[PDB]
C-alpha cells in the first residue's frame, strides 16, 4: 500500500543487478507491446507496440492473493529430461550451500518404556555358571561408551527412576498367591531403600516415595518403613552400604548400586562391590524377605557367586530391566530370603540374557553411527543437514544450470525423503533456501546414478509468495506402529540378498511410484520392475545398471510372461491383489505358483496377511474376519485379505513341497530397528511391540525354489507333549544346528544346548 | 618424439570437416521441431555442435 523503507531498498537493491531485455525503445516514442493484451487507447505522444514484432511467449492471468506462509514447505521434485553431470552437480552444491550449520539433534527416543522380564522356572535342571555363556569381552570400548551416551542424550523423559520402579513394583505384586488369597506384601509393610539420591527431578527426593507412601501402587497399598541410605541424601542416613552397616531388618530390600567411579577397567573391584552388598543385604532380610539389587556389569563370575554363596538360602529368582536406553543395568529381584532352596540357573533366564545382550549389541551398531554434538557438516556421517540457497530466485527452466544443477544435485543426496524449499520473507536478496538430510540410504541410490535431472521448473515457480525459513533439526517426531513394520519387511530384503547380501537379480512386484527399492538395493544390483501404476518421477530414466521398467499389473491373465530374476518381491501387494479378483486364496495363490514356475526365479517373498499362531484380534489396527476371510484394517478401513496358517500349509502340502519354507522372524529381533533409526525417526519402545505383535499376523513368507524341501509338522499330539516328522536326505551322522537367530536350541550331537521346554 | 595430447577426458584429433558438417545438419532435423519439442518439455534445448 503505501511501500516501507525496507521493502524499497529491497527492491532497488534487486534491480540493481544483471540481465537484459528483448523489446526495446526508441526515445522518440512509448512502444507498448505488440501482442495485443495491453489495453492501449490512443496516447498522444505513443504510437503503438515495439516497432519489431520478434518471438516470445506471453499469456492471460490473475496473481493468487497468498498471505505470508509462516511455515516451512514441502517439494515434490518432479523430474525434466536434461541429466546434468555428477561434478557439476557437486560442484553447484558446493557453490549454494548455506551449509555447514550446527544441527539442532533432537531426538533418538521419543519413548523409553519398556519392561524386559528374567524369571524363575521349574526347568533348571542341569544348568549351572559353566552353561552360562560370558559377557560381550569388549564392552568398553570408546565408540560403544560414545553410542551411550549420545542415545542418552537424545531422550529426555527425566523421570527415568519413577518408571522404572513403578513397573517393578507392578511386577513384584503381581505375585498373588491361592493359598492365601493375598499378595506375597500385605499393607503397611516394609522398605529398605538403598542406594539413595537427592534426585533433582524436579521432586528433589526419589519421585517414586512420595507416591508409594501416599498410595500410588496399583493394586497393593502402602508401606509402612522406608528408608533413604546412601552418599547423595536428603531424608536419610551416611552410610556405606557395601561394608557391614547397622544391622536393621527390612522385607522388601531395595538395593541400589550408584555406580561412581572413573576407573571401568577393574572388573573385579565392579563384582566384588555387588558381592559385597549382596551379603548385607541378606543380613538386611526380615525372615522370608525379598530383595532387588541393581547391578549395573553383570557376569558369569557374578552369577556364580550370586549361585553358590546365596542360593541356597532363597527360594525363587525374578529379574528385570526398565528399558529407557541402551545399557546393561539388571534389576536382581531376588524372593524368599534366609530360607532353604535349591535354586539353579534357568532356560527363561537364559533366553533373556541373550535377548538382552543382543538387543544392546544391535542398537549399540547403530548408534555408533550418529552424528555427535557439536558436530559440523563433514559430509561423512551417515546423517546431517545439506542446504543449498538460492540468491534472488532463478528458478527458469533448463538452460539456467547453475541453480537448476544445484536443486537437481541437492536431490541426487537426499533422494526421496528430504526435501524443502522456502522463498524467505527477507529484505535484500530473497533466499529460496533448499533444505536436505543425508541417510546410508539416500546415498545408495545417488550411487546407481549417470547423471542428475534437472527438475521442471514450473512446480516450483507455482509459489508466488513469501515462505518463511526452516528452524533446521535432524530428528523429527515419532514411530508409527505401521510404518515401524513396513520397514522391517524392507531390512529383511537388503540382508537376504542372493546368497547373504552377494548380489541380486530380482523384481519388484508393485514398484511404489517414489521407487524406495532402489534406496534398498545395493547399487550393483540387477532388477526388474513392475510399476503397475504410470510412474513418471524419477522412474526409469538412468537404465545403465539395468533398471528394467514393466509397467502394468502382473495378476492380470498372461503379461507376467516376459520377467525373469531370481527374487520376486512383494509385501502387502497381494493381499490387495487378491481381494481385487474376488478370488479363493488358494486358487489365485495357486495360478501364481505355476504363473513364477515358467520363470528363472529363486526367492518367493510372499507376504501374505496370514497368522503364525493363534488368532488374537489387535484392536485399532488388526480386526479379524473369518466368514470372508479377511482383515477389516483399523486405519480408516483397509480390506487386506487374510488367511489363516493351517489352511495355508494345507495348500502347499496337497500341491508340493518342493521348495525352501521360511518365516521371516521380525518379532524378537532388533536387527531392523537400526533401519529406522538411520531415517531421522525418534524411535518408541512401546510402538515396537505393537507392531512386533503385528508381525505374527503380517509376516514375510519366503519361499525359495532351488533348494531341498523344509518339513514342518506341528499338528499331531501338540498339548505341550510333541509332534513326529522327519529331516531328510541328509549325512548319517548329523550336526543338527537348528537355532533362533543364533539361540542354540537344538545342536543335534551338541546336545549341551538342550533348552526347550520338552 | 611425440606424445597425444589429452584423450584423458578432451584433446583428440582434428575433426573430420565432413563429419562436422553432416552433424550439425542432423541437429537441424531436430530443430524443424523445436516449438514442439519446448512445448513436450522434452530437453528442446539446441546443442549447438
Same mark, same amino acid.
Given at each position: ?758 | *618424439?611425440? !606424445? ?6 578432451? =584433446?583428440?584429433? %582434428? ?8 552433424? *550439425?545438419? !542432423? ?6 521441431? =523445436?516449438?514442439? %519439442? ?12
Amino acid at each position: 500500500a503505501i511501500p516501507t523503507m525496507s521493502d524499497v531498498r529491497s527492491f532497488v537493491a534487486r534491480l540493481m543487478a544483471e540481465g537484459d531485455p528483448q523489446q526495446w525503445f526508441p526515445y522518440r516514442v512509448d512502444q507498448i507491446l505488440y501482442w495485443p493484451e495491453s489495453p492501449f487507447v490512443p496516447p498522444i505522444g505513443p504510437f503503438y507496440a515495439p516497432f519489431r514484432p520478434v518471438n516470445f511467449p506471453f499469456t492471460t492471468g490473475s496473481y493468487t492473493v497468498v498471505p505470508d506462509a509462516s511455515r516451512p514447505l514441502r517439494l515434490l521434485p518432479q523430474y525434466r529430461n536434461a541429466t546434468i553431470t555428477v561434478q557439476q552437480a557437486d560442484d553447484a552444491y558446493e557453490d549454494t550451500a548455506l551449509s555447514p550449520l550446527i544441527t539442532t539433534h533432537g531426538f533418538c527416543v521419543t519413548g523409553g518404556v519398556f519392561t524386559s522380564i528374567y524369571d524363575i522356572s521349574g526347568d533348571p535342571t542341569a544348568y549351572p555358571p559353566a552353561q552360562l555363556v560370558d559377557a560381550p569381552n569388549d564392552y568398553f570400548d570408546r565408540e560403544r561408551m560414545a553410542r551411550r551416551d549420545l542415545f542418552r542424550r537424545l531422550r529426555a523423559p527425566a523421570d527415568r527412576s519413577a518408571i522404572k520402579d513403578r513397573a517393578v513394583f507392578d511386577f513384584l505384586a503381581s505375585l498373588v498367591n491361592p493359598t492365601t488369597a493375598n499378595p506375597v506384601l500385605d499393607t503397611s509393610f516394609s522398605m529398605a531403600y538403598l542406594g539413595a539420591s537427592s534426585a533433582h527431578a524436579n521432586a528433589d527426593e526419589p519421585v517414586i516415595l512420595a507416591d508409594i507412601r501416599s498410595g500410588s501402587i496399583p493394586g497393593l497399598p502402602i508401606p509402612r518403613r522406608i528408608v533413604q541410605f546412601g552418599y547423595d541424601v536428603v531424608h536419610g542416613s551416611l552410610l556405606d552400604l557395601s561394608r557391614a552397616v547397622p544391622t536393621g531388618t527390612f522385607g522388601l530390600v531395595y538395593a541400589d548400586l550408584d555406580q561412581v567411579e572413573d576407573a571401568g577397567t577393574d572388573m573385579p573391584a565392579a563384582n566384588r562391590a555387588a558381592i559385597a552388598m549382596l551379603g548385607t543385604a541378606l543380613q538386611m532380610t526380615t525372615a522370608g524377605g525379598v530383595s532387588v539389587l541393581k547391578v549395573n556389569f553383570p557376569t558369569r563370575a557374578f552369577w556364580t557367586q550370586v549361585f553358590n554363596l546365596y542360593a541356597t538360602h532363597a527360594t525363587t529368582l525374578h529379574l528385570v530391566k526398565p528399558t529407557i536406553v541402551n545399557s546393561s543395568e539388571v534389576f536382581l529381584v531376588f524372593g524368599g530370603r534366609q530360607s532353604n532352596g535349591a535354586l539353579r540357573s534357568t532356560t527363561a533366564l537364559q533366553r533373556a540374557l541373550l535377548s538382552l545382550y543382543a538387543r544392546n549389541a544391535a542398537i549399540d551398531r547403530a548408534v555408533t553411527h550418529i552424528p555427535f554434538f557439536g558436530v559440523p557438516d563433514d559430509g561423512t556421517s551417515d546423517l546431517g543437514i545439506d542446504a543449498v540457497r538460492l540468491f534472488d530466485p532463478m528458478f527458469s527452466d533448463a538452460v539456467a544450470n547453475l541453480p537448476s544443477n544445484a536443486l537437481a544435485s541437492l536431490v541426487s543426496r537426499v533422494v526421496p525423503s528430504s526435501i524443502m524449499f522456502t522463498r524467505v520473507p527477507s529484505n535484500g536478496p530473497v533466499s529460496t533456501t533448499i533444505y536436505g538430510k543425508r541417510t546410508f540410504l539416500s546415498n545408495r541410490r545417488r550411487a546407481r546414478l549417470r547423471d542428475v535431472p534437472m527438475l521442471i521448473t514450473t512446480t516450483l515457480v507455482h509459489q508466488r509468495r513469501f515462505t518463511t525459513p526452516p528452524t533446521f533439526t535432524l530428528f523429527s517426531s515419532e514411530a508409527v506402529p505401521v510404518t515401524t513394520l513396513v520397514a522391517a519387511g524392507y531390512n529383511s530384503f537388503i540382508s537376504e540378498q542372493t546368497r547373504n547380501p552377494n548380489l541380486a537379480h530380482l523384481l519388484d512386484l508393485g514398484t511404489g511410484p517414489e521407487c524406495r527399492i532402489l534406496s534398498l538395493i545395493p547399487p550393483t544390483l540387477q532388477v526388474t520392475m513392475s510399476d503397475s501404476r504410470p510412474c513418471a518421477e524419477l522412474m526409469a530414466s538412468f537404465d545403465p545398471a539395468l533398471t528394467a521398467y514393466v509397467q502394468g499389473d502382473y495378476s492380470t491373465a498372461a503379461f507376467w510372461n516376459g520377467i525373469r530374476c531370481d527374487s520376486a518381491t512383494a509385501i502387502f501387494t497381494i493381499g490387495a491383489a487378491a481381494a481385487a479378483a474376488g478370488t479363493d486364496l488358494i486358487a489365485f495363490v495357486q495360478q501364481l505358483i505355476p504363473r513364477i514356475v515358467a520363470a528363472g526365479g529363486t526367492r518367493m517373498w510372499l507376504q501374505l496377511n496370514t497368522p503364525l499362531y493363534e488368532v488374537s484380534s489387535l484392536p485399532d489396527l488388526i480386526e479379524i474376519d473369518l466368514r470372508d476371510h479377511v482383515y477389516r484394517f483399523n486405519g480408516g478401513e483397509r480390506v487386506e485379505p487374510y488367511a489363516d496358517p493351517v489352511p495355508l500349509q494345507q495348500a502347499i502340502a496337497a500341491l508340493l513341497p518342493a521348495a525352501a519354507l521360511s518365516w521371516h522372524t521380525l518379532s524378537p529381533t532388533c536387527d531392523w530397528l537400526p533401519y529406522i533409526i538411520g531415517v531421522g525417526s525418534p524411535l518408541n519402545l512401546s510402538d515396537i511391540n505393537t507392531a512386533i505383535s503385528y508381525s505374527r499376523l503380517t509376516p514375510i513368507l519366503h519361499i525359495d525354489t532351488t533348494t531341498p524341501p523344509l518339513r514342518v509338522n506341528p499338528v499331531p499330539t501338540p498339548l505341550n507333549q510333541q509332534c513326529a516328522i522327519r529331516i531328510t536326505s541328509l549325512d548319517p551322522a548329523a550336526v543338527l544346528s537348528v537355532q533362533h537367530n543364533g539361540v542354540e536350541v537344538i545342536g543335534g550331537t551338541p546336545g549341551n544346548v538342550i533348552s526347550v521346554a520338552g | *618424439s611425440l !606424445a597425444i595430447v589429452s584423450d584423458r577426458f578432451g =584433446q583428440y584429433s %582434428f575433426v573430420n570437416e565432413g563429419m562436422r558438417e553432416t552433424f *550439425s545438419k !542432423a541437429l537441424f532435423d531436430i530443430n524443424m521441431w =523445436q516449438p514442439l %519439442f519446448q512445448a513436450t518439455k522434452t530437453g528442446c534445448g539446441p546443442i549447438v555442435l
